[PDB]
Amino acid sequence: GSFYLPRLEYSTLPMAVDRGVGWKTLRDAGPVVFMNGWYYLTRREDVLAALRNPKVFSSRKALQPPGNPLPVVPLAFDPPEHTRYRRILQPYFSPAALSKALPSLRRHTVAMIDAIAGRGECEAMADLANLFPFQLFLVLYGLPLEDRDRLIGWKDAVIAMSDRPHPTEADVAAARELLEYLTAMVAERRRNPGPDVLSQVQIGEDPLSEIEVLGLSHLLILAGLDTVTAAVGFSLLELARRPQLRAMLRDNPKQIRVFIEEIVRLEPSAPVAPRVTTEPVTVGGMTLPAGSPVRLCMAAVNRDGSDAMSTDELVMDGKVHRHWGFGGGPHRCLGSHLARLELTLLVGEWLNQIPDFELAPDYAPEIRFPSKSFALKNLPLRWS
Numbered sequence: 001g002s003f004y005l006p007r008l009e010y011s012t013l014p015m016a017v018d019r020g021v022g023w024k025t026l027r028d029a030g031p032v033v034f035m036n037g038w039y040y041l042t043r044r045e046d047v048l049a050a051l052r053n054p055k056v057f058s059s060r061k062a063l064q065p066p067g068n069p070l071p072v073v074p075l076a077f078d079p080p081e082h083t084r085y086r087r088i089l090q091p092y093f094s095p096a097a098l099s100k101a102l103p104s105l106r107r108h109t110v111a112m113i114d115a116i117a118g119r120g121e122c123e124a125m126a127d128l129a130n131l132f133p134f135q136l137f138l139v140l141y142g143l144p145l146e147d148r149d150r151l152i153g154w155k156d157a158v159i160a161m162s163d164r165p166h167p168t169e170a171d172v173a174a175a176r177e178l179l180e181y182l183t184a185m186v187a188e189r190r191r192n193p194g195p196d197v198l199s200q201v202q203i204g205e206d207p208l209s210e211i212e213v214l215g216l217s218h219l220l221i222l223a224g225l226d227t228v229t230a231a232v233g234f235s236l237l238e239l240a241r242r243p244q245l246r247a248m249l250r251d252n253p254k255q256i257r258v259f260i261e262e263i264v265r266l267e268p269s270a271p272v273a274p275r276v277t278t279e280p281v282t283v284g285g286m287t288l289p290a291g292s293p294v295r296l297c298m299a300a301v302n303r304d305g306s307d308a309m310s311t312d313e314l315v316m317d318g319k320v321h322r323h324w325g326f327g328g329g330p331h332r333c334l335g336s337h338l339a340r341l342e343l344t345l346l347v348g349e350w351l352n353q354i355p356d357f358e359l360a361p362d363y364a365p366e367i368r369f370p371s372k373s374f375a376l377k378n379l380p381l382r383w384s
C-alpha cells in the first residue's frame with residue numbers, strides 16, 4: 001500500500017523554458033502527485049486506462065459548470081449522452097469530410113502568408129498564429145469574414161474570464177455579445193438549413209436542439225482555435241532553428257504530416273485532462289476515494305521514454321509516429337483531423353513563400369507559466 005502522497009507546488013514546476021524538464025520533474029515525483037487541489041496521474045499505464053474508462057473517470061463531474069449553463073457539447077458529457085453526441089458529430093470531422101474543404105482553406109492560408117512574406121519579419125503569434133484559426137473557422141462554417149476581429153475579441157475575453165471569480169464589467173458584456181451573435185446564427189440555420197455542418201446537425205433522424213448547437217459552437221470557439229494557435233507557434237519555432245528540416249519539408253506533405261505529429265506530441269496545447277472519479281480507484285498502490293479530482297498527464301506520457309516514439313526529442317524518422325497530444329479514450333479531440341489539416345497547410349504554404357527564416361537575435365522561446373496557455377509568448381522571425 002502507498003500511504004505517502006507526493007505534493008508539489010504547480011507554479012514552481014520548471015516549465016517555461018523546456019516542457020521536457022517540467023514533465024520529468026512531475027513524473028519523477030511519483031505516479032500520483034497532488035498539486036493545488038488535484039491528483040495528477042503521471043504514468044502511461046494509469047493515464048491511458050483512465051482516459052479509456054469514462055464510467056470510473058467522469059468528464060461530466062469535472063467539467064459540468066454550476067448554475068444553468070449552455071451545455072458543453074460534448075466535452076462535459078459521459079456515456080450514453082456523450083456517445084450519442086460523438087456519433088452525430090463524427091461524420092463532419094473525419095479526414096474525408098474535411099478534405100473537401102482543403103481548396104478553400106488553402107486559398108485563405110495562401111492569402112494570409114501573402115500579406116506577411118514581403119515584410120522580411122513578423123511576430124508570428126500576433127501576426128499569424130493568433131488570427132489563422134478563427135479565419136479558417138469562419139471559412140469552414142460560413143460566417144461573415146468581416147466578423148473576425150470582434151469574434152476573436154469575444155473569444156479572448158471569454159477564455160480569460162473563465163477561471164476567475166468576480167467578472168469584470170467588460171468581461172460579461174463580451175460573453176453576452178458572443179451568445180447573442182451565436183444564437184441568431186443558429187436560429188437562422190434551423191429555419192434555412194444549408195449544406196453546412198451547423199445546419200445539418202439540426203435536421204435528419206436525430207437532430208440537435210438549438211441550445212445543443214449553441215453549446216457546441218461555444219465549445220468549438222473556446223477549445224478548437226487557441227489550441228491550433230499554440231501549435232502554429234511551436235511549428236514555426238522549430239522550423240526557424242532547423243535549416244535542413246526546413247529544406248526537407250518544403251513541398252513535402254508526407255514529412256510535414258510527420259513533423260506536425262511531433263509538434264503535437266511534444267507541445268500538446270492541452271497537456272492535461274481533468275476527471276473526477278466515481279468510485280474508489282487504486283493507482284500506483286495508492287487508493288483515491290470516490291469523487292477525487294484527477295488530472296491525467298498526456299504530455300508527460302508522450303515523453304516518458306518508454307519507446308523510441310516517446311522521447312524528449314523531435315524525431316522525424318521511424319516508421320511509426322503516435323502520441324496522446326489529442327487525448328485518448330472516447331473524448332479524444334473531435335477536431336484532431338481538422339487540426340492536422342490546418343497545421344500541415346500552414347507549414348506547407350509558409351515554406352512555399354518563406355522557405356528560409358530564422359529567429360530574431362537574442363530571442364529565447366518561453367511560455368508563460370503558470371498561466372491558462374501553453375503557447376509561446378511571442379515568436380520574432382526574420383528573413384531576407
Ligand code: HEM
Nearest residue numbers: 074075224227228231269270273326327331333334335339
Ligand atoms: C493542436 C490542436 C488541438 C489540440 C492539441 C487539442 C486537444 C484536445 C484534447 C487533449 C482533447 C480531450 C479533452 C478531454 O479528454 O477532456 C480535446 C477535445 C476536443 N477538441 Fe481539441 N484539440 C485541438 C484542436 C481542436 C480543433 C481544431 C477542434 C475543432 C474545431 C477541437 C475541438 C475539440 C472538441 C469539440 C473536443 C471535445 C471532444 C469530446 O469531449 O468528445 N479541438 N482536444
Ligand SMILES: [Cl-]
Nearest residue numbers: 064071072076
Ligand atoms: Cl453541461
Ligand SMILES: [Cl-]
Nearest residue numbers: 118119120121
Ligand atoms: Cl512593413
Ligand SMILES: [Cl-]
Nearest residue numbers: 322323324328
Ligand atoms: Cl492509441
Ligand SMILES: [Cl-]
Nearest residue numbers: 253344345348
Ligand atoms: Cl502542403
Ligand SMILES: [Cl-]
Nearest residue numbers: 360361363380
Ligand atoms: Cl526586436
Ligand SMILES: [Cl-]
Nearest residue numbers: 367368369377
Ligand atoms: Cl507573459
